[PDB]
């Protein structure tokens, strides 16, 4: 009437397995690990050394480049990895226009046919996208397009949301600090070399092109952010108002980074392959590096299976398979002694 049942679960005698730790038990475990991690580990190294890239640090182009001819870039600003050997170092010159705005023109040689897709990034160092004041500083409803009034704005976009009894429309530290350098959408071939057109469409994420919708503000109650006031000197009108649904360079910047050294995508070309030739990229210099104190670069990678030329994952598979092939032998060392 009160007797507990004699099941093996109530009497603490469940069927159980105890780990046998012995040099005949854990030895085929350590061999199965170090025979399946080494085809993976060298497969992530052979994929990372097939990525071809070129990184030109154009940070001091407004200071260390003459405006007359094509001098060479100092080699401290150049990193590059290709299959074939390069023959000419990349060149660079400054160019002012009738308005007085500078431009940095980088000429470079690509020594072999790159038959993968070509992606143009810019690298920024010493910029804290991951600051706690910075990550949360935007309005979610304004990105969706809702005409939010003043006192129901997101209070985390606090120093930049309202200038003169108005609404800063892309409020926040993120949209105010947007990278302004305009990469030219063509790699101009110099001599006996064709052009290479580069698309700036489908650059951002696919969920970003949905949630970034055109605004339902009417361009009379909204002011640009204070660092956009060179592109919009008179302000916001119904004509010059930005459509952030198709502004896919703005969607890349708002997708913040994890670390103070990051890439951002600008241009891509999936359709064709660029051949060997002397190309030229022109960069309109609008973003000063005295704002954040780091460097800005120009990247011309291709993609691998794990991203780019990053050897860290394949090495991590070989340190682990190195320890699981070391201690598969040092089982036999301490036993005999």
């Amino acid at each position: 009437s009160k007797k507990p049942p004699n099941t093996a679960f109530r009497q603490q005698r469940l069927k159980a397995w105890q780990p046998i730790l012995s040099p005949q038990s854990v030895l085929p475990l350590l061999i199965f690990v170090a025979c399946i991690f080494t085809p993976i580990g060298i497969g992530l190294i052979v994929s990372a050394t097939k990525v071809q890239d070129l990184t030109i640090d154009y940070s001091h182009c407004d200071t260390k480049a003459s405006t007359t001819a094509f001098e060479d870039i100092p080699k401290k600003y150049i990193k590059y990895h290709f299959k074939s050997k390069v023959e000419n170092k990349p060149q660079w010159r400054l160019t002012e226009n009738e308005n007085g705005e500078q431009s940095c023109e980088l000429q470079f040689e690509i020594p072999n046919d790159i038959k993968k897709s070509i992606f143009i990034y810019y690298k920024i160092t010493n910029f804290y996208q991951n600051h706690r004041r910075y990550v949360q500083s935007f309005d979610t409803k304004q990105i969706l397009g809702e005409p939010i009034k003043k006192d129901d704005l997101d209070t985390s976009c606090s120093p930049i949301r309202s200038r003169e009894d108005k609404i800063i429309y892309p409020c926040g530290l993120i949209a105010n600090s947007m990278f302004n350098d305009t990469f030219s959408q063509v790699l101009s071939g110099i001599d006996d070399t064709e052009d290479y057109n580069l698309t700036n469409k489908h650059i951002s994420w696919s969920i970003d092109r949905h949630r970034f919708k055109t605004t339902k503000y009417n361009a009379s109650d909204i002011v640009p952010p204070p660092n956009w006031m060179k592109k919009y000197p008179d302000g916001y009108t119904d004509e010059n108002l930005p459509d952030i649904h198709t502004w896919e360079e703005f969607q890349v910047w708002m997708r913040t980074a994890a670390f103070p050294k990051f890439y951002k995508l600008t241009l891509k070309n999936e359709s064709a392959s660029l051949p060997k030739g002397k190309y030229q990229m022109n960069i309109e210099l609008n973003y000063p590096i005295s704002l954040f104190g780091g460097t800005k670069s120009f990247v011309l990678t291709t993609n691998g299976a794990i991203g780019g030329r990053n050897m860290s994952l394949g090495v991590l598979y070989l340190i682990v398979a190195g320890l699981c092939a070391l201690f598969g032998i040092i089982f036999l060392v301490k036993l005999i002694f």
């Binding site: 507990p4 603490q12 159980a16 730790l21 994890a258 050294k261 005295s290």
Partner: protein, 1112 residues
């Protein structure tokens, strides 16, 4: 004083007395909120997170959202309140089976005894208690069925005394014997206040224009049991919680276990890691934001003052690092403690089949205290003994006779003194031979077994005869006598008759005079005129009183009897020497005149009848001696030997007399042969301080070996224990009690059984257990660290108020050595893991402050981090502490010295807590440095050039820290059942299914809006699935090598006479070598004088029940 009217219930409730219920429960409906909150806030993790959740409410401070830690705190405070309520309900319905027990209650409108419950007993309510029924309230008897309205009560729950006490109703009230005349009682009863003084009472009843001076001879208490009488008609006075034995019994107190006191030190040891890492991260925020103020102009930093946003960022790192302290640690260990109490109460080896009673754990907060017990404070009567006495053997004419012979102790060649054993059929063959000369001296021995008593015989409806004895010693002499023939059948007011078995003759002996047993006399005697006409005196008593009254001219069996007593007392039996003398006709009439003038003297007759009794008991002839065995419970001597091998020191605190506890201690092998008794029997407070100092001047003058300390035993009376607990003398007592093997305390009050446990508790760090039964040791159970009660044997009150209620004493072996040492070793590993599990995850927030300019940005999502403590890593702390037997149950019972691993606290310290927190730092620095070299610029994906953002990397940090901490629990655990397969690799499969469903439903409800594109760019990416299977193997490669190295190598276990001639010269030291152990359970308040004169057995029952008139 308390005024009680008789037979009007409306007038005796306007004073507002208590009812008859008792409350066992920890809290009522009123005191549930303060007692549960004080129990939870005394844990330091629940007090820290109450302060953290207020720090999240000041705006712009918290890195996560503001409802993150108050939502986790309300979950664990609700699960902790559910475990408390489903125990206090089980404490309330097991309390309900007492209040709903049967009690016949007189109803004045009905005018008959109607059946009701106990709880319907109000003060002033005349009840009726039948035979062998517990008394339901503090009751004064009015009349009874026995002659002159008497009854016998058993007080084995009031104190430990194993005899019966006569209670005699007043002559003015004993006429009310019928139910129909019970409606004429009109008056009042003036009683005293409840005072918990057991043996004193004063009251005055005015019944029908006449005063009645009441007495403690007219009052029966609640714990007592009415025995050897048909019924009584008493009215109740105190009831419920104002009774004399349940005044100081309170509700279940908060008992903070010793492991929970260690967690409170490892939380203080974790605040000093918290405050350091807040200070490292907040002085780097002041340095960097003022040195690089021209390089952080895109943050639009204010720069108000260096002390203003020091504090505003002091609280941010307080919140970001607050989950170093585990929030789900205390409610995890509460449900390991709840479910271990469930598996204790479901064991068949702790289930008593005879009463159909399993063990139950009421206070389940103390399951792990059963692995650290260092002192067991036991009770004797009912706990160690079965409260049954049986005539074991007898020694007559220098020969011994026993039921069945233990063959090593058989009839051998003597040393001049015959030792050995014979059967009882040889006693029959030596009796029926007129050629053997022992046959006259055997014949007057067996008739002394069936005449000299005060047992009253009552024939049942069958041919079975029931012997009704006050003292259980002389009740076993008649029953054990009658099994050898010469059955005592009936008793007349002036004679007894003995029915001989083999001849069928019924000889009748005239009882002339009887002499009462006395503690100063240590003997009792009776004079019988035989059917021959020749009178004869019989006598039974102690050898230290009998041997001073002998004829050395006559008997030759004396030195053969005394050697049989030493063989009996070393076995543990209770002995009694039997002597007689043949007094002729003329010597009687000059003595009876001397006896009559002593008896008819009104005053001072207590000490003059024995001074008239020793004038006839001078010249006796020693027939021989008896041996009565007080039955112990089964498995008592094997449990005491096993628990003493485990390092536990057994103490005995009993309300019984001293000569019984030495006998039971000799029988249960606490005491032994070749052992010394440090007896402390002193009458004043300065006589014991001499006795405590005279022993410690002698037994610690030289350092004692561990063999010689096993020859010491402390025996202290309850009056000397009341003086040796004065605060000036408390340390002299523990200095000799810690060098003795066993401590016995005799005749101690219910309060003194608590003040001994409260004295070892505050003078040492050892954990104490107190096992007992009945309400005389209920205060002993509230005052211990673990209180155990013996379950229902017609007198349960300790097993209600206890923390564990076991079936008998032998279940203490498996409860401590198996279920106790498992519950300490499993919980100590489940707490060191839960400290580690919140360090391997939340310390990636600290290495991130060097990579975000000391801002305090969260590396992972706000709600994903609360699910870490609640869903995905809550099962391996549970299953390690529950289903993982670290060592076999067959090995813990076989080698009891493995219990000392839990007593020293080798598993759970604060120093070994640092080997897990540093293991949490090392695992957290591999997740961080491993996932910043991968995902270097965010350029780790292959999705048409797209990059992994801040939140796609934060999911890889969260998931890698889950596989690391589940892979650690897969190496920590010892035994892999099928319930570990749902916990350790089944909470990884839980998170890998929960995450695509949580992050594809909840962002559309504006909850966790950082996950809009994370599932495509984590689960669709090849770099995420390759990170999860190489970084946990990289970080647990040291834990797989240390666990393999710990298995093969580095193993742990899971001048004799110079003192013995010096210790005897102290004042009250006795040795157990030639002690001739005498014990008789009769008392002076037992009423053995007049009950032999008042009973006619052949007279049958009256019309009003089983009532018999006084036939004197």
């Amino acid at each position: 004083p308390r005024v009680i009217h008789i037979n009007d219930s409306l007038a005796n409730s306007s004073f507002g007395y208590s009812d008859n219920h008792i409350s066992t429960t920890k809290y009522n409906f009123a005191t549930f909120l303060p007692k549960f909150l004080f129990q939870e806030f005394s844990k330091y993790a629940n007090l820290f997170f109450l302060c953290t959740s207020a720090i999240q409410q000041v705006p712009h401070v918290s890195p996560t959202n503001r409802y993150t830690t108050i939502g986790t705190l309300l979950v664990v405070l609700i699960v902790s309140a559910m475990k408390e309520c489903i125990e206090d309900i089980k404490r309330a319905n097991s309390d309900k089976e007492l209040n709903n027990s049967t009690a016949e209650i007189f109803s004045e409108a009905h005018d008959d005894f109607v059946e009701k419950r106990w709880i319907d007993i109000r003060v002033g309510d005349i009840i009726r208690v039948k035979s062998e029924e517990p008394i339901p309230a503090d009751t004064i008897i009015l009349s009874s069925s026995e002659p002159e309205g008497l009854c016998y009560i058993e007080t084995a729950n009031l104190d430990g005394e194993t005899n019966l006490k006569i209670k005699q109703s007043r002559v003015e009230t004993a006429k009310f014997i019928d139910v129909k005349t019970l409606k004429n009682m009109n008056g009042k009863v003036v009683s005293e206040q409840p005072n918990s003084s057991l043996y004193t009472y004063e009251g005055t009843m005015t019944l029908n224009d006449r005063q009645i001076p009441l007495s403690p001879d007219q009052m029966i208490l609640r714990g007592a049991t009415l025995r050897n009488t048909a019924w009584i008609f008493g009215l109740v006075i105190f009831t419920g919680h104002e009774t004399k034995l349940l005044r100081n019994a309170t509700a279940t107190p908060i008992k903070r276990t010793a492991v929970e006191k260690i967690i409170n030190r490892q939380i203080i040891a974790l605040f000093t890691v918290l405050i350091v890492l807040i200070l490292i991260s907040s002085i780097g925020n002041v340095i960097m934001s003022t040195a690089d103020a021209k390089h952080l102009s895109y943050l639009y930093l204010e720069g108000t003052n260096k002390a203003g946003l020091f504090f505003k960022d002091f609280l941010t790192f307080w919140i970001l690092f607050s989950n170093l302290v585990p929030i789900s640690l205390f409610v995890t260990v509460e449900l390991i403690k709840y479910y271990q109490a469930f598996m204790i109460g479901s064991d068949l080896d702790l289930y008593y089949e005879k009463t159909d009673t399993p063990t139950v754990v009421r206070t389940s907060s103390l399951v792990e205290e059963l692995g650290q017990i260092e002192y067991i404070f036991s009770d004797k009567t009912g706990t160690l003994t079965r409260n049954i006495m049986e005539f074991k053997s007898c020694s007559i004419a220098g020969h011994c006779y026993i039921d069945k012979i233990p063959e090593d102790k058989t009839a051998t060649v003597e040393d001049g003194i015959e030792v050995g054993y014979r059967k009882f059929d040889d006693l029959k063959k030596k009796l029926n031979d007129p050629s053997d000369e022992d046959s006259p001296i055997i014949n007057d021995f067996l008739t002394l077994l069936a005449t000299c008593h005060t047992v009253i015989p009552e024939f049942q409806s069958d041919g079975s005869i029931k012997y009704q004895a006050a003292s259980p010693d002389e009740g076993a002499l008649v029953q054990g006598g009658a099994d050898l023939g010469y059955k005592f059948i009936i008793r007349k007011p002036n004679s007894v008759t003995v029915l001989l078995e083999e001849t069928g003759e019924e000889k009748e002996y005239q009882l002339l005079n009887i002499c009462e047993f006395n503690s100063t006399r240590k003997r009792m005697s009776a004079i019988f005129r035989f059917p021959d006409g020749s009178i004869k005196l019989f006598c039974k008593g102690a050898d230290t009183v009998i041997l001073e009254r002998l004829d050395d001219e006559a008997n030759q069996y004396v030195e053969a009897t005394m050697r049989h007593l030493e063989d009996y007392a070393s076995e543990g039996l209770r002995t009694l020497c039997l002597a007689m003398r043949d007094i002729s006709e003329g010597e009687y009439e000059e003595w009876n005149s001397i006896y009559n003038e002593a008896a008819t003297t009104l005053d001072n007759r207590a000490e003059k009848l024995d001074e008239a009794a020793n004038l006839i008991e001078k010249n006796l002839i020693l027939i021989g001696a008896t041996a009565i065995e007080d039955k112990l419970q089964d498995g008592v001597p094997e449990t005491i030997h096993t628990l003493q091998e485990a390092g536990i020191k057994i103490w005995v605190l009993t309300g019984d007399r001293q000569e019984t506890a030495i006998n039971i201690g000799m029988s249960c092998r606490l005491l032994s042969e070749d052992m010394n008794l440090l007896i402390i029997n002193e009458e004043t407070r300065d006589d014991t301080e001499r006795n405590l100092l005279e022993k410690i001047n002698a037994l610690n003058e030289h350092q004692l070996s561990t063999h010689d300390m096993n020859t010491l035993a402390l025996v202290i009376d309850g009056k000397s224990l009341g003086f040796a607990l004065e605060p000036e003398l408390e340390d002299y007592l523990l200095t000799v009690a810690k060098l003795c093997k066993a401590v016995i305390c005799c005749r101690v009050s219910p309060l003194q059984k608590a003040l001994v446990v409260k004295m070892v508790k505050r003078k040492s760090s050892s954990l104490l257990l107190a096992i007992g039964d009945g309400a005389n040791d209920v205060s002993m159970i509230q005052a211990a660290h673990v209180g155990v009660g013996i379950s229902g044997m017609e007198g349960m009150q300790a097993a209600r108020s206890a923390d564990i209620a076991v079936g008998q004493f032998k279940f203490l072996k498996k409860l401590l050595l198996v279920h106790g040492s498992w519950s300490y070793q499993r919980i100590s590993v489940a707490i060191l893991y839960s400290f580690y599990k919140n360090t391997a995850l939340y310390m990636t927030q600290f290495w991130y402050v060097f990579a975000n300019a000391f801002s305090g940005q969260s590396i992972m999502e706000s709600w994903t981090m609360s699910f870490y403590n609640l869903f995905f890593t809550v099962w391996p702390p549970f299953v390690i502490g529950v289903f993982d037997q670290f060592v076999s149950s067959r090995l813990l019972e076989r080698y009891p010295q493995l219990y000392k691993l839990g007593q020293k606290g080798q598993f759970f310290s604060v120093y070994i807590f640092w080997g897990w927190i540093i293991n949490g730092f090392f695992h957290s620095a591999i997740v961080f440095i491993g996932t910043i070299l991968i995902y270097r610029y965010g350029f780790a994906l292959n999705m048409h050039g797209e990059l992994a953002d801040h939140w796609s990397w934060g999911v890889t940090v969260y998931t890698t820290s889950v596989i690391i901490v589940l892979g650690k629990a897969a190496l920590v655990t010892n035994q892999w059942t099928k319930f570990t397969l749902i916990a350790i690799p089944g909470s990884l499969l839980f998170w890998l299914i929960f995450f695509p469903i949580y992050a594809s439903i909840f962002p559309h409800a504006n909850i966790s809006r950082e996950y809009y594109g994370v599932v495509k760019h984590t689960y669709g990416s090849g770099v995420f699935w390759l990170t999860l299977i190489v970084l946990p193997i990289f970080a647990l490669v040291r834990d797989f090598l240390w666990k393999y190295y710990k298995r093969m190598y580095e193993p742990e276990t899971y001048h004799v006479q110079q003192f013995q001639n010096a210790i005897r010269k102290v004042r009250q030291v006795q040795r157990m070598k030639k002690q001739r152990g005498f014990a008789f359970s009769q008392a002076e308040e037992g009423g053995q004088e007049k009950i032999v004169r008042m009973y006619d057995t052949t007279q049958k029952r009256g019309k009003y029940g089983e009532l018999q008139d006084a036939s004197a």
